[model samples]
Target: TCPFYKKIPGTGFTVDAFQYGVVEGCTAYFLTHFHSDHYAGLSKHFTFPVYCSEITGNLLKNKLHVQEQYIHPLPLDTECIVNGVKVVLLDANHCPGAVMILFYLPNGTVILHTGDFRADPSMERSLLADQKVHMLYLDTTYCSPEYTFPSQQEVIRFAINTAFEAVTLNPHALVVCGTYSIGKEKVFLAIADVLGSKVGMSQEKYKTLQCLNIPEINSLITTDMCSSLVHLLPMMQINFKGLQSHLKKCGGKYNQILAFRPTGWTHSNKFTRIADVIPQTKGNISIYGIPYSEHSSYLEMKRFVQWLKPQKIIPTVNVGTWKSRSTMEKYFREWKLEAGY
Candidate 1:
């Protein structure tokens, strides 16, 4: 929504386009996830109804401190009518409560707005496989050939294996998992669960996780830092300069630090596999820039667009200028030609 200020024209139902004062026909708002970039212009007082999944609504209410009156929590996969437009939430697999919003317009236009997602082949098992979608609003974050990285499972395995090897060498090593406010919970949770390590996080992050209302993640949290073997830190504090201060603050109880800064930007086309990703070390700190992305990779996007057979494709991101429209379409042409379309 950032680059393209164009709303769905007549619908007035903006999909994460909540910035500025208001749009011409704005009636309702839709948020794909709880990320700041997505819900930038949302206010505590703006009463125009905003629709999202259950977990996203919980975060909006508790974390963002927005009034519940303006929030509408929609169930997943079930279609509902909102001011004449039929809408439904489908599997996104990116972050908690993040989903692909499908809008079946009045004129029988089928628009699939993948607010942000990691496209999986398993999603094809759903009705969307054969559904005739007129238009597809794609998440172009990692759409290019250069943004290729390891799978989420592969990345998590790399993290777990790295943690196991590091902790084995230093029995008391603290496993630091870097994360955003919501994403990459899977990485830390997987590593901690496999290693049987207790996770230490601030009470604020704990509150946000509680809003998820998932017991599997809830059981891993521990208040006693001395008993905890793993810890969660914001992405900003995952660096050597940051961990240098943190390691000193905590002392040598958990002497050495092994951190994983999970992100997609860490890799490029050169890193075709996990064997190629490098790690950094300094003093007692070892930082692994895990190519753990929550969004679809280049191959995934290519496969999805080919399988979809949509009449039109909309570039949600990276289409800021008229010039980029042709540049981004290079992959589109490649995808369609390969699909025999």
Candidate 2:
């Protein structure tokens, strides 16, 4: 949850089990993504017959182990009503089963809550048309244009190209790349798809991949076959010590490894500093700052905010601070829009 939400007082209109108060008889409820931050208060609370998509529901039950009668799984690009609120689940494209939600109020107010979604047209267009997104819950995690990222296609291209470059540069060594097993597996496959016969999934990747049943876009590839790749293992437990040993064995066999992390290693007080250090694959690691993010950029944020054109827009996502809201508010204030509460 963002700091503003954590620290802000409740609205006091109608507090659900999650303690997130809403307008009385708000009718519908939603959970955008299974990401902890976005859906933190679910399961334990906020069980007012929530609505979502089928894949998303399966993901929640499979991943988070949460289920409820109100957790209705609607289809993508479709509409359903819960508690009188019109609900639509669109593509989020952040994690494998992320979603972008749109809520319709009785007063004709439309709210678009974009769960951490990237700016890729392939992913972004999956969202319903913006003609009715009156209030956009913009994913401002990377609202600053300075935090630019490449498209998913380009990111995959660069990662694969780098791996091939390493193979050419050091034929005697094996190659490896890192990504989240649950979400980034597709990205890894996409890279392997291009490699044709130069890249393949690690054993650890194979284990999780079996459950995923992902399409065979890569057909088949040829590369070092080991028990694991850098970050492509969905750990069932906090078994980092065992994972370290496995990585060493694999690293010793592979000459190069390419890994990707959504949140890089910045141990500041504000954000969670993900440990970027790879144990076994030390000198063989190549990091890229491609814009392979699930959040919108500055231009996209501004455009979406303007598109919503809400009387009072509240930017969301991110903890530690909501400085972006103020920044965006300044921009919108010029356009005569109310920003903060």
Q: Which candidate should be chosen as best, given TM-score against the real structure?
A: 1
Write the residue-wise lDDT of candidate 2 on 1-341 in tens digits. Answer: 22332221222112112335543534444555555545656653344655556655665555555665656777778777655456677777666656776666677766666667764545435545555555555566764545544455655666666656655676544433445435655455555554444345555445434433345633443234552232343333213343445447654665444444334212231332112222224454544433345556565666555544565555665434557557655666764544432
Question: Which residue ranges in model 2 land beyond 4 Å of their true spot?
Answer: 1-29, 41-48, 68-70, 120-131, 168-172, 180-182, 196-213, 217-247, 255-291, 318-324, 334-341
RMSD of model 2 against the true structure: 7.0
Query: How well is each residue in 27-141 modelled by candidate 1, as lDDT tens digits?
Result: 8888899988898888687778999999999998888778989999999878799988888899798888898888888888888888889889988877586568898888888
Deviation in Å, model 1, residue 230 alpha carbon: 0.5
Which candidate should be chosen as best, given lDDT against the real structure?
A: 1
Q: After superposing candidate 1, which stretches have Cα over 4 Å from the reference?
A: 1-6, 267-272, 321-323
Model 1 is weakest, by summed lDDT over 10 consecutive residues, at: 1-10
TM-score of 1: 0.94
lDDT of each: 0.81, 0.51
Model 2 whole-model lDDT (C-alpha atoms)? 0.51
